[PDB]
Motif scaffolding. Structure first.
Motif, PDB file in Angstrom:
ATOM      1  N   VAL A 101       0.894  -1.262  -0.141  1.00 22.53           N
ATOM      2  CA  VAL A 101      -0.040   0.015   0.038  1.00 22.53           C
ATOM      3  C   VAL A 101       0.721   1.212  -0.007  1.00 22.53           C
ATOM      4  CG1 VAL A 101      -2.044   1.176   1.287  1.00 22.53           C
ATOM      5  CG2 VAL A 101      -1.302  -1.124   1.281  1.00 22.53           C
ATOM      6  N   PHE A 145     -13.545   8.745  -0.100  1.00 24.45           N
ATOM      7  CA  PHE A 145     -14.242   8.422   1.382  1.00 24.45           C
ATOM      8  C   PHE A 145     -14.953   9.703   1.663  1.00 24.45           C
ATOM      9  CE2 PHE A 145     -10.911   4.905   2.289  1.00 24.45           C
ATOM     10  CZ  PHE A 145     -11.661   3.975   1.368  1.00 24.45           C
ATOM     11  N   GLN A 168      -5.139   9.201   5.189  1.00 25.46           N
ATOM     12  CA  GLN A 168      -4.132   8.660   4.422  1.00 25.46           C
ATOM     13  C   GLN A 168      -3.593   9.473   3.115  1.00 25.46           C
ATOM     14  OE1 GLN A 168      -7.651   6.031   3.479  1.00 25.46           O
ATOM     15  NE2 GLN A 168      -6.510   4.381   4.000  1.00 25.46           N
ATOM     16  N   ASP A 200      -2.015  -2.476  -4.089  1.00 22.18           N
ATOM     17  CA  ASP A 200      -3.055  -1.563  -3.868  1.00 22.18           C
ATOM     18  C   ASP A 200      -3.234  -0.174  -4.824  1.00 22.18           C
ATOM     19  OD1 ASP A 200      -5.114  -1.039  -1.784  1.00 22.18           O
ATOM     20  OD2 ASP A 200      -4.306   0.684  -1.584  1.00 22.18           O
ATOM     21  N   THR A 201      -4.462   0.051  -5.269  1.00 26.35           N
ATOM     22  CA  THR A 201      -4.616   1.026  -6.412  1.00 26.35           C
ATOM     23  C   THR A 201      -3.567   1.482  -6.917  1.00 26.35           C
ATOM     24  OG1 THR A 201      -5.606   3.304  -6.786  1.00 26.35           O
ATOM     25  CG2 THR A 201      -4.800   2.776  -4.303  1.00 26.35           C
ATOM     26  N   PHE A 256      -7.514  -0.397 -10.205  1.00 28.35           N
ATOM     27  CA  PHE A 256      -8.871   0.225 -10.200  1.00 28.35           C
ATOM     28  C   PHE A 256      -9.020   1.598 -10.904  1.00 28.35           C
ATOM     29  CE2 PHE A 256     -12.457   2.046  -8.136  1.00 28.35           C
ATOM     30  CZ  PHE A 256     -13.212   1.113  -8.171  1.00 28.35           C
ATOM     31  N   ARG A 291     -20.927   4.728  -7.463  1.00 26.97           N
ATOM     32  CA  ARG A 291     -20.452   3.416  -6.931  1.00 26.97           C
ATOM     33  C   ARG A 291     -21.040   2.981  -5.725  1.00 26.97           C
ATOM     34  NH1 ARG A 291     -16.725   7.038  -5.536  1.00 26.97           N
ATOM     35  NH2 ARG A 291     -16.224   5.819  -3.760  1.00 26.97           N
ATOM     36  N   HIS A 326     -12.447  -7.961  -0.342  1.00 35.52           N
ATOM     37  CA  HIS A 326     -12.701  -7.302   0.748  1.00 35.52           C
ATOM     38  C   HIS A 326     -13.461  -5.897   0.621  1.00 35.52           C
ATOM     39  CE1 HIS A 326      -9.143  -5.698  -0.760  1.00 35.52           C
ATOM     40  NE2 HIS A 326      -9.201  -4.725   0.065  1.00 35.52           N
ATOM     41  N   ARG A 414     -19.071  -2.834   1.363  1.00 38.27           N
ATOM     42  CA  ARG A 414     -17.734  -3.745   1.342  1.00 38.27           C
ATOM     43  C   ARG A 414     -17.910  -4.593   2.727  1.00 38.27           C
ATOM     44  NH1 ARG A 414     -12.658   0.276   0.913  1.00 38.27           N
ATOM     45  NH2 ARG A 414     -13.017   1.003   3.053  1.00 38.27           N
ATOM     46  N   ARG A 418     -16.953  -8.453   4.925  1.00 40.61           N
ATOM     47  CA  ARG A 418     -15.861  -8.542   5.991  1.00 40.61           C
ATOM     48  C   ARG A 418     -16.515  -8.831   7.356  1.00 40.61           C
ATOM     49  NH1 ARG A 418     -13.024  -2.445   5.008  1.00 40.61           N
ATOM     50  NH2 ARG A 418     -12.613  -2.903   2.864  1.00 40.61           N
TER      51      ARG A 418
HETATM   52  O1  LIG Z   1      -9.793   2.823  -5.040  1.00 42.87           O
HETATM   53  C1  LIG Z   1      -9.984   1.713  -4.596  1.00 42.87           C
HETATM   54  C2  LIG Z   1      -9.085   0.658  -4.519  1.00 42.87           C
HETATM   55  O2  LIG Z   1      -9.003   0.056  -3.176  1.00 42.87           O
HETATM   56  C3  LIG Z   1      -7.982  -0.226  -2.287  1.00 42.87           C
HETATM   57  O3  LIG Z   1      -7.469   0.773  -1.843  1.00 42.87           O
HETATM   58  C4  LIG Z   1      -8.196   1.466  -0.618  1.00 42.87           C
HETATM   59  C5  LIG Z   1      -7.600   2.476   0.413  1.00 42.87           C
HETATM   60  O4  LIG Z   1      -6.060   2.048   0.401  1.00 42.87           O
HETATM   61  C6  LIG Z   1      -8.655   0.403   0.393  1.00 42.87           C
HETATM   62  O5  LIG Z   1      -9.770   1.118   1.077  1.00 42.87           O
HETATM   63  C7  LIG Z   1      -9.282  -0.822  -0.405  1.00 42.87           C
HETATM   64  O6  LIG Z   1      -9.740  -1.876   0.530  1.00 42.87           O
HETATM   65  C8  LIG Z   1      -8.122  -1.265  -1.435  1.00 42.87           C
HETATM   66  O7  LIG Z   1      -8.227  -2.635  -1.978  1.00 42.87           O
HETATM   67  C9  LIG Z   1     -11.451   1.415  -4.682  1.00 42.87           C
HETATM   68  O8  LIG Z   1     -11.374  -0.227  -4.565  1.00 42.87           O
HETATM   69  C10 LIG Z   1     -12.006   2.239  -3.713  1.00 42.87           C
HETATM   70  O9  LIG Z   1     -11.457   2.401  -2.513  1.00 42.87           O
HETATM   71  C11 LIG Z   1     -13.675   1.730  -3.591  1.00 42.87           C
HETATM   72  O10 LIG Z   1     -13.633   0.667  -2.776  1.00 42.87           O
HETATM   73  C12 LIG Z   1     -14.370   1.714  -4.760  1.00 42.87           C
HETATM   74  O11 LIG Z   1     -15.644   2.109  -4.518  1.00 42.87           O
END
Ligand SMILES: O=C(CO[C@H]1O[C@H](CO)[C@@H](O)[C@H](O)[C@H]1O)[C@@H](O)[C@H](O)[C@H](O)CO
Ligand SMILES: [Ca+2]
Length: 557
Positions: A101, A145, A168, A200-201, A256, A291, A326, A414, A418
């Motif tokens: 990450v 978020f 973050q 991650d992303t 993503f 989304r 997840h 999500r 979980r």
């Molecule tokens: O940008 C991402 C990547 O997620 C990754 O990056 C996120 C932050 O690091 C984390 O929250 C995730 O669990 C991880 O897998 C999307 O999946 C977004 O978080 C959202 O879920 C889409 O609608």
């Protein structure tokens, strides 16, 4: 000729350690819990495990806000516990993939505490700091978020960028000293024996120079815009050259937001970037642009997406395949039928799909049992930070009511993925002896490992059997793939081929009987397996009669 790399033929299982097994009653799963269960995963047939983040974290986003990249999250255990997990996996000939990450860190990371102290701190450009504009944020960038993607810091008067949580802050890949620090952190784990890394992303590393405002069109789909940094691939190639060139770890990018046609840039083996892709065209194939809303799709859309994704891999690229993770609702609820009378049948049919797809399959924890979405009743039932973001962005702004949000996120959140793994029917499904951090689904009384493991007809047993067949059938991992009828919206049918051997996979997606006519000149030779079938076809069969949610794999002549 050459053999296929181990990862192209492997079956992965994703463990979300927070919700797998707790061994100290604090309600949060830990390493000792996972290590206790390797015999279970080995027995299923699992070759490799991907774990979600296990590093020191304030847990504002359950591991994805990392405050120290070289210490183990206190909830999961100690570094000694981590090494023990590694050792115990090796004893079973299994491999570990960790989560990486590095698009952003926690705001409690020493780097960021330094960074924010002054404009002249040596760590100031480890992150992105900018002046506001017109008494506002530097630009119109939204956060995944909730709210703006820019947080003002009174310590300096400037704003820092955060695509995700305010806690973050995004890492500044434009700074070579930061990149070198990230490369060293990666070696630290790689030197410990790690067999794989999921990024991650991965596509949001490079930022747009100047940070101009998003267009109104772009604002509609901002996630895609954040994947268009001009130096992205230059950075991924540098990382491969300085790190992965020297190891034999497999690399898996979570791509993503990126348009599907850019995916080959990440995974073409010749480009020396990443080995495998996690794409989201399929899992978000029925997700609205915001989304959180759903859009009705059919099997035709499902199969057509798959076909597109598979073709994107081409000759030199390689895909992962997954129906759950997840960040998404439960596979049987999303793609199958989680009603009590169709849950088991549909969950087996999706298994057949998952394990006969061209690519490396990942089974998300619980889907081998047929775990379902959770019956959320109020918005206070969600732990997820992303739901709070929807409430900020759509409810507080009057765009939607709290009831409307709830109705919709219940199906997409999500947190569906979980809820604690359902091990047995003891208190809290055997996940913990204390109080689970997120409530266990009441259906644990029917759906739990202990009940399925002994039963030859269970969802677990069917997944176990499919994992055996795939392992023994090379065409089902590395074979070619062909959709027989991309327009058919009732029955999913395709072939896998390798070295003159062809297999037919047929899956009824309807809760009604259906028929299937094989392509001209093709005939059943053997039946390898079926679910929900009262009788296999006859050798020579030129068509199939299908029960509701029947699936099967057949060798043809
Ligand atoms: O940008 C991402 C990547 O997620 C990754 O990056 C996120 C932050 O690091 C984390 O929250 C995730 O669990 C991880 O897998 C999307 O999946 C977004 O978080 C959202 O879920 C889409 O609608
Ligand atoms: Ca614990």
């Amino acid at each position: 000729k050459p053999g296929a790399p181990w990862w192209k033929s492997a079956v992965f299982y994703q463990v979300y350690p927070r919700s797998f097994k707790d061994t100290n009653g604090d309600g949060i799963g830990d390493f000792k819990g996972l290590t206790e269960k390797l015999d279970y995963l080995k027995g299923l047939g699992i070759d490799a495990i991907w774990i979600n983040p296990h590093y020191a974290s304030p847990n504002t986003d359950n591991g994805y806000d990392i405050s120290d990249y070289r210490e183990v999250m206190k909830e999961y255990g100690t570094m000694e516990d981590f090494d023990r997990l590694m050792a115990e996996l090796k004893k079973r000939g299994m491999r570990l993939m960790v989560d990486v990450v590095i698009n952003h860190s926690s705001d409690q990371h020493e780097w960021f505490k330094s960074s924010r102290a002054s404009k002249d701190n040596p760590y100031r450009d480890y992150y992105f700091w900018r002046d506001g504009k017109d008494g506002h944020e530097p630009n119109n960038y939204p956060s995944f978020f909730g709210g703006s993607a820019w947080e003002k810091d009174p310590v300096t008067g400037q704003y820092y960028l955060h695509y995700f949580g305010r806690q973050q802050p995004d890492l500044n890949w434009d700074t070579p000293k930061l990149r070198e620090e990230l490369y060293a952190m990666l070696r630290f784990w790689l030197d410990k024996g790690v067999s794989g890394m999921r990024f991650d992303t991965v596509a949001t590393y490079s930022k747009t120079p100047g940070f101009p405002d998003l267009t109104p069109e772009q604002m509609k789909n901002f996630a895609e815009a954040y994947t268009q940094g001009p130096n992205l691939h230059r950075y991924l190639q540098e990382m491969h050259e300085k790190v992965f060139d020297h190891y034999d770890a497999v690399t898996a990018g979570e791509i993503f937001g990126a348009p599907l046609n850019q995916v080959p840039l990440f995974i073409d083996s010749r480009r020396k970037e990443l080995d495998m892709a996690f794409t989201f065209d399929l899992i978000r194939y029925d997700r609205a642009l915001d989304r959180w809303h759903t859009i009705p799709r059919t099997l035709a859309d499902f199969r057509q997406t798959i076909d597109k994704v598979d073709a994107i891999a081409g000759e030199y690229g390689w895909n992962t395949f997954f129906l759950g993770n997840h960040d998404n609702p439960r596979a049987v609820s999303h793609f199958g039928d989680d009603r009590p009378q169709w849950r088991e049948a549909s969950a087996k049919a999706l298994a057949t799909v998952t394990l006969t797809q061209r690519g490396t399959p990942f089974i998300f924890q619980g889907d081998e049992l047929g775990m379902t979405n959770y019956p959320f009743k109020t918005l206070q039932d969600f732990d997820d930070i992303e739901v709070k973001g929807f409430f900020q962005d759509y409810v507080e702004t009057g765009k939607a009511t709290a009831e409307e949000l709830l109705t919709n996120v219940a199906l997409t959140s999500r947190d569906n993925a979980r809820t604690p793994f359902q091990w047995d029917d003891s208190a809290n499904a055997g996940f913990t002896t204390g109080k689970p951090w997120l409530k266990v689904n009441p259906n644990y009384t029917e759906i739990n490992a202990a009940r399925e493991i002994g039963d030859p007809k269970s969802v677990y047993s069917f997944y176990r059997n499919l994992i055996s067949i795939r392992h023994e059938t090379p065409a089902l991992s590395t074979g070619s793939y062909r959709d027989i009828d991309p327009s058919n919206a009732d029955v999913y049918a395709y072939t896998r081929s390798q070295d003159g051997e062809t297999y037919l996979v047929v899956v009824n997606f309807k809760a009604e009987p259906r028929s299937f006519t094989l392509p001209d000149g093709m005939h059943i030779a053997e039946t390898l397996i079926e679910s929900s079938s009262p009788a296999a076809p006859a050798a020579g069969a030129a068509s199939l009669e299908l029960q509701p949610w029947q699936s099967g794999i057949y060798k043809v002549k």
